[PDB]
Amino acid sequence: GLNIEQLYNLLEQRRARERALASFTLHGLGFSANVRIKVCDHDDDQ
Amino acid sequence: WTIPQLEEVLKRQRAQDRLFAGFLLHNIGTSADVQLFICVATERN
């Protein structure tokens, strides 16, 4: 239900949002596969 | 503590229940310590 102007306004309002991204550098291993990713607290040290 | 007054103490020690951990060990080449840790549920650390 969104026209050109509608998706336009959506894109400008979306450009201002602040996001957390995962950057991926993948290549393929000769077979289709999936990766599940999880976040955890910054505890690098019961 | 000389001989005749510690057997009752040993009996008292054995009377109360205790916990334990068992080990089977052999020669590893160099004398070294062993460190044990006790993980508990909550993830797990």
How is the topology of this model organized?
This is part of a larger assembly, with 2 copies of chain A.
Chain A: H1 4-15
PDB class: oxygen transport
Keywords: Glycoprotein, Respiratory Pigment, Cooper Protein, Carbohydrates, oxygen transport
Entry title: Cryo-EM structure of N-glycosylated Pomacea canaliculata hemocyanin
Output the radius of gyration of chain A.
18 Å
How many distinct helices of chain A?
1
Measured between the Cα atoms of the first and last residue of chain A, the distance is 52 Å
Main β sheet profile of chain A:
none
- The rough form of chain A would be described as flat
Oligomeric composition of the shown chains: part of a larger assembly
Number of strands of chain A: 0
What share of the residues of chain A lie within helices? 25-40%
Strand content of chain A: under 5%
Greatest interface: A-B, 1 and 5 residues
- Content-based structural category of chain A: mainly alpha
Give the H and E element order of chain A.
Answer: H
Overview of this protein structure:
The PDB classes it as oxygen transport. Keywords: Glycoprotein, Respiratory Pigment, Cooper Protein, Carbohydrates, oxygen transport. Cryo-EM structure of N-glycosylated Pomacea canaliculata hemocyanin. Chains A, B are Hemocyanin. Organism of A, B: Pomacea canaliculata. The structure is cut from a larger assembly and holds 2 copies of chain A. Chain A has one helix spanning 4-15. Chain A is built from 1 helix and no strands. Helices cover 26% and strands 0% of the residues of chain A. The longest helix of chain A is centred in the first third of the chain and has 12 residues, at 4-15. By secondary structure, the first copy, chain A, is mainly alpha-helical. The A-B interface holds A 46 and B 38-40, 44-45.
